[PDB]
């Protein structure tokens, strides 16, 4: 259903906002425990620094020794107790409950494919989509290099090397312009050189594999692809 797709995402948004509230209350709980523990450690720093500057005179008076015995026997356990106290259960329970209502792998490919379909439908280059310049629409939204990478991967699994090539290039461009990302250029060139190969651009595939090996000279498949590419080309002659 088209309008039930939107109703489902809208519901998912309300669910996700609530997960954020539960998450913020969790953070608030950790900060309070950590602040208590922090105060407690500092207090312990004072007791120990002053002790260590004359340990023998300190330990003989038995009142101090009594204090020393009690801290390790009793106060450090209370601290272990405070330290071991889990503050995340409220949040985790809630999230565990909410994941029943979460989307799966299939919903994620669907959204990816709808992006590929709008791109094909409106004839957009990938940089336009990523930069949020869609046929008038505000507000702008953007794709990370890693988003680009994922779209490249959805196309790939369907053996759509046209879109695979396109999105890996988009990811690559963004890494090259200097975007900080969890995705690395070698992974992209791996997929990219490959898509270029299925599509019969032997030259481009050879070049890209060389760029990969520049970054990773011991990349096992890229080394194999290099020898292979070079072989077929010498034989097309």
């Amino acid at each position: 259903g088209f309008f039930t797709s939107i109703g489902q995402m809208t519901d998912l948004i309300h669910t996700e906002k609530d997960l954020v509230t539960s998450l913020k209350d969790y953070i608030k709980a950790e900060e309070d425990k950590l602040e208590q523990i922090k105060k407690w450690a500092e207090k312990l720093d004072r007791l120990t620094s002053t002790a260590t500057k004359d340990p023998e005179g300190f330990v003989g008076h038995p009142v101090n020794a009594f204090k020393l015995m009690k801290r390790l026997n009793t106060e450090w356990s209370e601290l272990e107790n405070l330290v071991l106290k889990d503050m995340s259960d409220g949040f985790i329970s809630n999230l565990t409950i909410q994941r029943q209502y979460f989307p799966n792998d299939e919903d994620q490919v669907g959204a990816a494919k709808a992006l590929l379909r709008l791109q094909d439908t409106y004839n957009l280059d990938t940089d336009t989509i990523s930069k949020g310049n869609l046929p008038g629409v505000k507000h702008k939204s953007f794709l990370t290099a890693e988003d680009c990478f994922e779209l490249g991967k959805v196309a790939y699994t369907e053996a759509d090397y046209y879109h695979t090539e396109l999105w890996m290039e988009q990811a690559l461009r963004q890494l090259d312009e200097g975007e900080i990302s969890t995705i690395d250029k070698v992974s992209v060139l791996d997929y990219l050189s490959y898509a270029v190969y299925q599509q019969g651009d032997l030259d481009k595939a050879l070049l890209l594999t060389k760029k990969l090996l520049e970054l990773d000279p011991e990349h096992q498949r890229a080394n194999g692809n290099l020898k292979y590419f070079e072989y077929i080309m010498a034989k097309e002659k």
């Binding site: 790939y156 791996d190 997929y191 050189s193 490959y194 190969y197 498949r221 194999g224 692809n225 020898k227 292979y228 072989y231």
Partner: peptide
């Protein structure tokens, strides 16, 4: 003779 590219993959 070399072998063909595997999936990246």
């Amino acid at each position: 003779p070399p072998g063909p590219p595997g999936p990246p993959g």
